Design a protein around this ligand. Structure first.
Ligand SMILES: Nc1ncnc2c1ncn2[C@@H]1O[C@H](COP(=O)(O)OP(=O)(O)OP(=O)(O)O)[C@@H](O)[C@H]1O
Ligand SMILES: Nc1ncnc2c1ncn2[C@@H]1O[C@H](COP(=O)(O)OP(=O)(O)O)[C@@H](O)[C@H]1O
Ligand SMILES: Nc1ncnc2c1ncn2[C@@H]1O[C@H](COP(=O)(O)OP(=O)(O)O)[C@@H](O)[C@H]1O
Lengths: 524, 50, 995, 289, 100
């Protein structure tokens, strides 16, 4: 663990430079990947990278080898199956970490420390309940204690997103149950549609290790509960990353290329944005206020971007001096890094300048259409315009504006409104006085028919025309066939905008919906 | 695009021989690398993913 | 109830609500066994008085962990609402403590991480210390504090560990790692519990670690825990507190019967205030703000109950507290509290947005503003006394009086407060009038101590201690505070307001944080602790809040004086009243007589100055109305582009001073024509003509020739007074003589013939149209003794013109000062103590020039050059702003006020577009007019130098015939050179007339 | 001329003697004098080069010896002055600091007498050269530096002992701890530090003559009365009666909690609680209890 | 010149012809003693330091030509203009770059 002292690492590198080593002498520095390590030490050594071998079977083997045999052999004998269940849960979450953000909304720090804490919890609670008896009934096992402790503190401590907590609760409630001691318990269902992994019938640590060693080496994401296309998504992400890395490598005269690129960008980006005319009647309407803020911000950003691009073109033409801001902008445009100045609205992480221009052109065109409709209709057309949630800079503000408009128009208070989502495939469907059209919403891992969800293996499905209706809050209990889907701003699933509800069709378990990572995306 | 990696493997095999990546698959052999090709003044940095 | 019993009742209600919720959950879940985990997860208490040791008498068990009460006296602390997230926090923290691991909650700010940890520590009765990890960090004392924690078994909670700088973070992390390894050594089952001398290496010595001690590290991602502490700390996610429950329980504890509906309304309303309202630094809409608003709403409800009870007791009916409580609108009380707390902090644009959101969330309810009739009457009297416009509600000046009332409320509530309105908004005119009205109402004399914080160094403000002899010197603020505290002249019986009137930056407010805090104490490097007297009110009149730390803003109340408060009609009325009342010929006399005269009866015709200026004001009254010529001209001129940023008050002050000079010229003509003083017709013609001339030279004085002509055409199109009838000459090129008619400036442009010698000498001021229009303007502005500022390209001879105009008066001695990036106010101090002496008048110390009867003018050559600090606010500019507005400055030795006498601060400038020229602050540009001295121009150059060429070629009698073609050729070539080599090609390609 | 300028600037150089609380005459201006010394030794050392150095070598060497002597003497002098100022502030800022440290106060007293004598002697002849020519001033000044350091260290050791004897003292700084341990008779001066050592304790309720600690008052005026008051007179040391106050606070809080629980058990086992009795119980006991 | 500390004094000397604050205290006294000597030695009989000091500056403006050598750098020239306008106002600038 030499990574803890970078300064001592510098000193050791200098000492190693100034020594007379014997032939048999050798220095072994074991460390973890951390930027704190000196470049000098890395330059003067033979680096060996030791990643953990991927696989559920490998994870179970590592967990079982780490835990001492005598600890598992402790009475009662149910402790062995408890430890196997905990190891399987740990393997499931750690392997699921790789497939992100579908499996986990963000990569959490699930490591050996959480496993050790969970093992200590299991030991203490089983010792408390059993009192030393050689065998105890599975009913008497404190399942609620284990589920609560590994959902709230042991494993859910690092979980911040509520939907990740819901997924973790579903995992714990599916695994940690008295039914897990039955000879026919299925750890994971629908591995390939037919085969299901079954619990080993043994009651000893040796039997569990033997079963782990006999796991087929044909792992697919369906083992973890994910759809079978998660592997394909990860593979295409890795391919794109490899292309980008090799392109950065191939980066190692450019005035003309930058000039023509900037000229193409300036031609592509629309020229002007017309601000909304603030009238006495218009200011009262919440939709007009929100759209005026949107067009003001869009026009400001558009003018800034256009002026910067014009100055870049002038510099590339050899006619303008390079200011420090201009020099930084030129460097970022050359390297392809998105400039920090053009980032007043949330964007996906690691998003190139070309994609930023492509998205900005669409946003500005949508805002131009919004402004034209507002000018022509005054205020009535703003309620009956189909606006993409991705196109707006702050979609949550749009949701709030729709809520305010409904509350003001229908004289209802703003705290007594609940959002009901209805998806219509008909083109130009008639909009109620309290319904607002929405386009561009993408459903991940599911298909909607007659406003009823169904599990699908497709990468994504585009909702034709989402309709947001605000209806007065009713104390009717939520049905068992209703699922709450998050609506993330982009595919990174880092920003949560709002949570719609949907109705499950036919016979599909909402637990599968929670585990499959089904969600709605404002933009794809 | 999901098979771009598996096809780049094939392209590398076509260009630089089939067994170009084969040695990487086999488990690392510390014996030869530590006995030879490492100078006694060269620290062996055995970095691992946290 | 008494406040202490009130807090006990609030704590009891807050705990009983959680107990009721837990009992309801137990009943619903059908829990039968006392060992069921649905019960074991709750914080349970077991009391055993039979135990001999008092520290082990009570056991607090929850889930697996079981602690003992430390029986530490915690006072009347702040119980938490016990939101379900705190439940998770308590469970995770107790699980971590039972596993001998410190807890590390993380999340955004305002979540309640430190409070949740501190409340857990207090629930177990354990002393808890919170180490703020901001810049106010005591590194040198942390080893001692950690040794104390180990020895006494008190808890330790850090606020934001990531805010630490890398070395300090690493050192504290190493200490925490050692301490936590020592703690983990307690958990070994094989360890002998009979003898457990667990030691930790702290301060290079062995310290015993008490088993009850614990360390919590609060993290704020956006980063993570240090690598060495990742394997020893249990992390918890405080991503979002349940604001709905936090409010509902508190409102139910405040007596509000409909607590649930009120909470479910107020929480989304605060979210909407955070989102929809314009982003401002001072807007605080966190859970802390909601908690306060709720407490204030409870106070308002109890005040209403007491008012109703007292009113019924005055009459003959009985009083039932429950009956009055039932018949009372809670939503109205909550909205009134929200408006009272949040309206002053809002900008003008956001107030309608706030009311729209309030109507959306709270439909059908309205906020009635609580008026103070006695203070409002006093406001009117003081406003009239100082020539101000007072208005009620929607009248002219209603917004300003509303702002003054909000200021009074904030003074009543807080001890330290800030007015952060933009330049020329009425901040000063507001607090002066409020102080005078309070003095006249309460009978307590009001005294203000305007202490500029940037004109002097931090050492000169707070005092410095001598490194060798350890002697303590009192700084300006410390001296003022000590003088107030001592109360040698009954200072405790007067209302002392320490107005700072200077921008706020995180250097000189660091020592003020303790004063603005609830401690109301000032800590000196000597060690003396100055307690803030109750009557002292620290007050900050700043322009913006771009460089102010959140601590100072949060510790102080604030009223935003938006620029829309001060309507131009109020300024016009102020100027008209001041002209009608205050004479201009008067100096020391007729000045204190205004204070001596409550009504000034019998002194209406005190001087022909007063009569003549009353006539002039009557003449210009129909032009200063709301929809007048001046207002439309100003509205059009704001659209125009000017050399410096335009402020309404700058143009208004310049115009007012030039009209004052017009009436003074009228008085001069009256004094030079005793037989026939000018009549009403001639006065009307002259005053209208000079008003047009003054608008032209005040609004467009900053801009160039083409846009001066644009404004002249606009005035000609919108005015009714007859103008010069010549076809193609700008109206700016015309002057107004004493007679009614105009007269072209060219009549005052003689073609002088310079002698052979001094053909190009510096003192050769060749009178030219520029040196005539600008000389007349500089005479007008210097007769008013204003800090005139001239701006233009370099070498334009601004100093020379300035010199040409100023040397015509045998009373002013120029002391040229050259400014640069290294200039400091100490340079001005040296100039003062060189050319002036500090005479001790009975009223106070006065700085005057040595030469009696002669006025001093301090030429500042390059006002823009002095470099802005890392937080802006050029120090010398701030000094000039203080000393030309507050009419004085504070000494750095005696710490007493110095009032200037016969000092003017005329200066030259370069345009801000030139490199290295830092733009001037509006707070200083407001007083100073700006004159745009551009390059002479082709015709002026042809004349200005033709004369020069004839004078030079007079030496050769035969070559004098080519003087005109030579000048034509020179002017042409100079123009081609100027239009050929621009500054874009090279930075030094500047072609001025000096060449 | 460079030699002559050195000679004149040093023969006319006078120390900046300054009043110090009317106690003695001290010295400021260390930066200027040290900078002058350093510049001059630099110049003389660099003078050893150049072909013209061969003349007036002995004068340069003697002058360099003079600069080295003054440099060492005043390098020790500045530290001695700083240490003596610090220790004089400590040993006269309290009355009991002499009682707690008899050997140390006596050592500093003897040092301060000798140092005041030396300061009077330099005040008689504030010239630099006359200062240098004092008989064995360097030996005495080094002795002062060594002895002063010993007292300062021993005093720090005593402070550490006092902190280790009462663990809560680690929460309060050095100067405030010195004030606490030194103002033992002025018990009313300790109330400003209780908010740092304890949690809610902002003062202590003293007796008529400040000889018995009756109880504790919190920050809000809320108070607790000790079941058995702690006697300052019986345990005059700050350590003893402070530890006794803490222990008595814990014991009294435990007993009051026991009584409050006894009452609230009767309160709970009822179907109708009289508001008067409940308010009386709430008023009787502390909020946390 | 790279240090900005000396540039203020150089600018003041270039513009005014004398830099205030350079001569103070006993240094000012010795300046006046040599100034007075020089004034009377030059035949400019003067005894009052206020008039005598003027004599000192009177000799300087006429007898001090400061020559600034600066490698060609557009950005550095712009910063020099930003920190000292007298270098392009009082100082006439001459350009000769690479030899032909
Ligand atoms: N009630 C009023 N009626 C008429 N004129 C008023 C009134 N209040 C203020 N004014 C005018 O507004 C001017 C500016 O107000 P004030 O002096 O308070 O500005 P300020 O806030 O101190 O400015 P800055 O922010 O630039 O320091 C006053 O000098 C006065 O001419
Ligand atoms: N359970 C709770 N009951 C009442 N107020 C709470 C609760 N939890 C947090 N708060 C309030 O939320 C705010 C959190 O501020 P604080 O805890 O000091 O900082 P941080 O959120 O950064 O840890 C405070 O106003 C605190 O009183
Ligand atoms: N009309 C004029 N009359 C007299 N001198 C003039 C006139 N126009 C230009 N000048 C000359 O132009 C030069 C301007 O120098 P200066 O006053 O230092 O410029 P600035 O004030 O812009 O720094 C002086 O030599 C001045 O005499």
């Amino acid at each position: 663990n030499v990574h803890l002292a970078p300064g001592w690492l510098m000193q050791l590198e200098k000492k190693l430079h100034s020594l007379q080593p014997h032939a048999c002498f050798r220095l072994f520095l074991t460390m973890e990947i951390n930027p704190k390590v000196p470049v000098n030490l890395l330059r003067a050594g033979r680096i060996f990278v030791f990643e953990p071998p991927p696989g559920v079977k490998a994870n179970m083997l590592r967990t079982f080898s780490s835990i001492p045999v005598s600890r598992i052999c402790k009475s009662p004998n149910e402790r062995a199956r408890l430890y196997f269940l905990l190891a399987w849960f740990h393997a499931i979450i750690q392997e699921r970490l790789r497939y992100a953000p579908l499996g986990w909304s963000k990569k959490y720090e699930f490591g050996e420390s959480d496993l050790r804490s969970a093992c200590d919890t299991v030991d203490t609670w089983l010792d408390d309940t059993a009192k030393g008896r050689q065998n105890i009934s599975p009913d008497k096992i404190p399942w609620s204690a284990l589920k609560t402790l590994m959902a709230q503190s042991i494993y859910g401590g690092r979980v911040d997103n509520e939907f990740d907590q819901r997924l973790l609760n579903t995992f714990l409630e599916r695994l940690f149950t008295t039914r897990s001691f039955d000879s026919e318990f299925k750890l994971a269902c629908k591995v390939d549609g037919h085969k299901d992994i079954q619990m080993p019938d043994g009651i000893r640590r040796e039997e569990f290790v033997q079963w782990v060693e006999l796991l087929p080496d044909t792992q697919t994401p369906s083992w973890l509960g994910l759809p079978n296309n998660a592997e394909r998504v990860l593979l295409t992400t890795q391919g794109v990353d490899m292309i980008s890395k090799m392109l950065k490598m191939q980066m190692l005269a450019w005035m003309r290329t930058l000039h023509t690129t900037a000229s193409n960008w300036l031609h592509l980006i629309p020229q002007t944005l017309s601000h909304l005319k603030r009238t006495v009647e218009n200011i009262k309407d919440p939709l007009f206020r929100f759209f005026e803020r949107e067009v003001k911000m869009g026009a400001k950003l558009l003018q800034d971007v256009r002026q910067d691009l014009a100055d870049v073109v002038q510099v590339c033409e050899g006619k303008k001096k390079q200011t420090n801001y201009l020099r930084t902008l030129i460097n970022e445009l050359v390297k392809g890094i998105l400039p920090r100045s053009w980032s007043h609205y949330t964007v996906p992480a690691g998003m190139t300048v070309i994609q930023w221009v492509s998205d900005f052109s669409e946003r500005i065109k949508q805002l131009q259409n919004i402004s034209l409709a507002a000018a022509s209709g005054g205020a009535k057309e703003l309620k009956n315009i189909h606006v993409c949630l991705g196109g707006l800079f702050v979609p949550e503000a749009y949701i709030t504006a729709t809520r305010q408009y409904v509350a003001q128009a229908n004289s209802w208070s703003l705290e007594e409104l609940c959002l009901e989502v209805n998806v219509t495939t008909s083109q130009g469907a008639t909009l109620d006085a309290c319904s607002f059209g929405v386009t561009g919403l993408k459903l991940q891992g599911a298909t909607c028919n007659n406003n009823k969800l169904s599990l699908s293996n497709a990468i994504s499905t585009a909702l034709p025309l989402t309709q947001l209706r605000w209806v007065k809050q009713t104390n009717t209990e939520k049905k068992a066939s209703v699922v709450t889907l998050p609506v993330y701003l982009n595919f990174t699933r880092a920003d949560l905008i709002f949570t719609v509800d949907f109705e499950i069709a036919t016979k599909e378990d909402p637990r599968s919906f929670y585990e499959r990572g089904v969600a709605v995306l404002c933009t794809e | 695009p999901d098979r771009l990696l598996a096809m780049a493997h094939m392209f590398v095999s076509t260009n630089l021989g089939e067994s170009f990546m084969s040695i990487m698959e086999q488990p690392l052999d510390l014996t030869h690398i530590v006995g030879t090709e490492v100078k006694p003044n060269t620290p062996v940095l055995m970095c691992s993913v946290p | 109830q008494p406040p202490l019993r009130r807090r006990k009742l609030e704590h009891l209600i807050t705990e009983l609500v959680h107990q009721r919720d837990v009992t309801r959950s137990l009943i619903k879940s059908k829990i039968d066994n006392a060992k069921s985990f649905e019960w074991l997860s709750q914080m349970r208490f077991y009391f055993d008085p039979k135990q001999t040791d008092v520290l082990q008498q009570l056991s607090i068990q929850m889930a697996n962990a079981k602690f003992n009460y430390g029986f530490e006296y915690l006072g009347v602390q702040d119980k938490l609402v016990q939101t379900p997230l705190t439940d998770r926090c308590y469970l995770t923290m107790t699980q971590a403590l039972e596993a001998r691991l410190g807890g590390s909650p993380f999340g955004p700010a305002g979540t309640g991480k430190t409070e949740s940890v501190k409340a857990l520590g207090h629930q177990l009765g354990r002393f808890v210390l919170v180490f703020n990890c901001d810049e106010t960090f005591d590194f040198q004392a942390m080893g001692r504090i950690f040794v104390g924690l180990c020895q006494v078994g008190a808890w330790g909670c850090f606020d934001e560990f990531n805010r630490l700088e890398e070395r300090m973070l690493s050192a504290v992390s190493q200490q925490v790692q050692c301490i936590q390894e020592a703690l983990r050594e307690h958990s070994n089952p094989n360890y002998d519990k009979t003898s457990a001398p667990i030691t930790c290496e702290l301060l290079n010595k062995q310290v015993k670690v008490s088993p009850d001690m614990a360390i919590f590290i609060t993290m704020n991602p956006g980063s993570n825990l240090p690598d060495n502490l990742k394997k020893l700390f249990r992390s918890l996610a405080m991503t979002k507190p349940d604001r709905q429950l936090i409010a509902q329980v508190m409102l139910y504890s405040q007596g509000f019967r409909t607590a649930e509906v009120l909470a479910n309304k107020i929480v989304p309303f605060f979210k909407l205030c955070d989102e929809q309202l314009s982003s401002q630094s001072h807007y605080d809409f966190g859970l802390r703000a909601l908690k306060s608003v709720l407490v204030s709403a409870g106070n308002v409800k109890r005040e209403r109950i007491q008012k109703i009870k007292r009113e019924k007791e005055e009459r003959g009916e009985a009083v039932d507290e429950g009956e009055i409580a039932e018949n009372l609108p809670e939503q109205e009380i909550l909205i009134q509290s929200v408006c009272e707390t949040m309206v002053p902090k809002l900008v003008a644009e956001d107030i309608p947005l706030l009311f729209s959101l309030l109507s959306d969330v709270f439909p059908g309810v309205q906020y009635h503003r609580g008026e103070m009739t006695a203070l409002r009457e006093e406001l009117k009297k003081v406003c009239q006394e100082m020539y101000l416009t007072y208005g009620d509600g929607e009248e002219v000046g209603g917004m300003w009086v509303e702002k003054v009332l909000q200021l009074y409320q904030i003074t009543q509530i807080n001890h330290g407060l800030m007015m952060v309105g933009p330049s020329g908004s009425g901040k000063s005119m507001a607090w002066r009038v409020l102080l005078k009205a309070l003095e006249r109402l309460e009978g307590v004399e009001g005294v203000a101590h305007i202490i500029d914080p940037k004109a002097i160094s931090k050492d000169h403000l707070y005092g410095t201690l001598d490194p060798n002899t350890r002697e303590w010197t009192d700084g300006l603020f410390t001296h003022v505070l000590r003088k107030i505290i001592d109360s040698v002249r009954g200072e405790l019986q007067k209302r002392q307001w320490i107005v700072f009137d200077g921008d706020v930056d995180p250097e000189w407010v660091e020592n003020l944080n303790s004063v603005l805090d609830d401690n109301k104490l000032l800590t000196l490097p000597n060690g003396e602790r100055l307690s803030l007297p109750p009557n002292v009110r620290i007050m900050f009149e700043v322009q913006d809040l771009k460089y102010a730390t959140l601590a100072t803003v949060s510790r102080c109340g604030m009223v935003w004086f938006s620029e829309d408060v001060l309507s131009t009609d109020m300024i016009f009325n102020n100027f008209l009243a001041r002209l009608r009342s205050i004479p201009l010929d008067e100096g020391e006399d007729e000045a204190q007589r205004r204070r001596k005269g409550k009504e000034d009866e019998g002194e209406e015709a005190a001087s022909p100055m007063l009569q003549i200026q009353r006539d002039a004001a009557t003449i210009m009254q129909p032009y200063f109305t709301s929809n007048g010529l001046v207002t439309k001209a100003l509205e059009h001129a704001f659209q125009l582009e000017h050399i410096m940023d335009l402020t309404r008050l700058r143009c208004l002050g310049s115009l007012f001073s030039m009209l004052h000079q017009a009436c003074r010229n009228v008085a001069q003509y009256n004094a030079n024509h005793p037989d026939f003083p000018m009549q009403i017709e001639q006065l009307e013609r002259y005053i209208q003509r000079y008003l047009v001339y003054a608008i032209l030279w005040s609004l467009s004085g900053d801009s160039r020739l083409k846009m001066r002509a644009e404004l002249g055409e606009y005035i000609r199109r919108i005015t009714t007074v007859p103008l010069p009838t010549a076809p193609n000459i700008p109206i700016i090129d015309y002057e107004v003589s004493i007679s009614g008619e105009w007269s072209p400036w060219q009549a005052k442009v003689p073609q002088i013939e310079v002698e052979t010698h001094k053909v190009a000498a510096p003192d050769v001021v060749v009178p030219t149209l520029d040196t005539v229009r600008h000389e007349a303007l500089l005479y007008t502005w210097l007769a008013e003794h204003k800090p005139l500022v001239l701006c233009g390209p370099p070498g334009s001879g601004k100093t020379m013109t300035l010199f040409s105009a100023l040397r015509a008066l045998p009373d002013m001695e120029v002391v040229g000062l050259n400014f640069s990036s290294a200039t400091t106010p100490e340079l001005l101090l040296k100039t003062f103590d060189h050319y002036c002496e500090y005479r001790r008048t009975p009223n106070g110390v006065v700085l005057a020039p040595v030469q009696l009867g002669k006025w001093l003018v301090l030429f500042c050559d390059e006002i823009n050059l002095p470099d802005m600090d890392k937080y802006g606010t050029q120090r010398v500019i701030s000094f000039i702003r203080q000393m030309v507005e507050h009419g004085g400055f504070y000494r750095t030795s005696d710490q007493t006020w110095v009032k200037l006498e016969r000092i003017q601060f005329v200066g030259a400038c370069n345009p801000p577009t030139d490199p290295g020229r830092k733009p001037l602050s509006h707070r200083f540009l407001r007083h100073v007019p700006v004159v745009y001295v551009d390059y002479p121009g082709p015709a002026s150059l042809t004349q200005i130098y033709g004369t020069f060429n004839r004078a030079m070629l007079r030496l050769i009698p035969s070559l004098r015939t080519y003087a005109e073609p030579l000048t034509a050729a020179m002017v042409e070539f100079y123009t081609m050179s100027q239009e050929r080599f621009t500054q874009d090609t090279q930075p030094h390609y500047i072609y001025s007339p000096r060449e | 001329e460079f030699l002559k300028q050195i000679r004149e600037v040093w023969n006319t150089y006078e120390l900046d003697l300054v009043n110090y609380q009317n106690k003695c005459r001290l010295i400021r201006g260390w930066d200027d004098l040290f900078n002058k010394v350093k510049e001059h030794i630099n110049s003389v050392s660099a003078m050893k080069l150049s072909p013209y150095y061969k003349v007036f070598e002995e004068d340069a060497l003697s002058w360099e010896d003079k600069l080295n002597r003054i440099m060492a003497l005043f390098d020790v002098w500045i530290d001695v002055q700083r240490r003596w100022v610090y220790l004089e502030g400590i040993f006269t800022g309290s009355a009991d600091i002499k009682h707690l440290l008899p050997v140390e106060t006596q050592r500093f007293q003897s040092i301060s007498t000798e140092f005041l004598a030396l300061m009077k002697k330099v005040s008689k002849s504030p010239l630099v050269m006359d200062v240098l020519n004092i008989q064995g001033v360097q030996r005495s000044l080094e002795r002062l530096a060594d002895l002063l350091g010993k007292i300062q260290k021993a005093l720090g050791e005593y402070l550490e002992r006092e902190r280790s004897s009462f663990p809560r003292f680690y929460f309060v700084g050095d100067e405030d701890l010195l004030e606490i341990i030194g103002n033992s008779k002025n018990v009313a001066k300790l109330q400003k530090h209780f908010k740092k050592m304890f949690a809610g304790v902002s003062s202590i309720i003293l007796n008529e003559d400040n000889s018995v600690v009756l109880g504790i008052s919190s920050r809000e005026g809320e108070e607790v009365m000790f079941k058995t008051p702690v006697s300052i007179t019986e345990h005059p040391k700050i350590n003893e009666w402070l530890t006794l106050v803490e222990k008595e606070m814990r014991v009294t809080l435990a007993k009051l909690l026991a009584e409050s629980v006894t009452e609230v058990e009767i309160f709970g086992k009822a179907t109708s609680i009289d508001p008067n009795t409940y308010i009386t119980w709430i008023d009787k006991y502390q909020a946390q209890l | 010149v790279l240090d900005s500390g000396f540039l203020e004094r150089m600018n003041t000397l270039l513009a005014n012809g004398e830099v205030p604050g350079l001569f103070e205290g006993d240094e000012y006294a010795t300046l006046m003693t040599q100034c007075k000597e020089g004034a009377q030695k030059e035949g400019l009989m003067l005894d009052s330091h206020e008039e005598l000091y003027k004599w000192f500056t009177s000799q300087v403006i006429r007898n001090l030509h400061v020559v600034f050598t600066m490698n060609p750098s557009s950005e550095g020239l712009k910063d020099r203009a930003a920190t000292s306008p007298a270098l392009f106002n009082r100082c006439v600038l001459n350009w000769f770059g690479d030899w032909s």
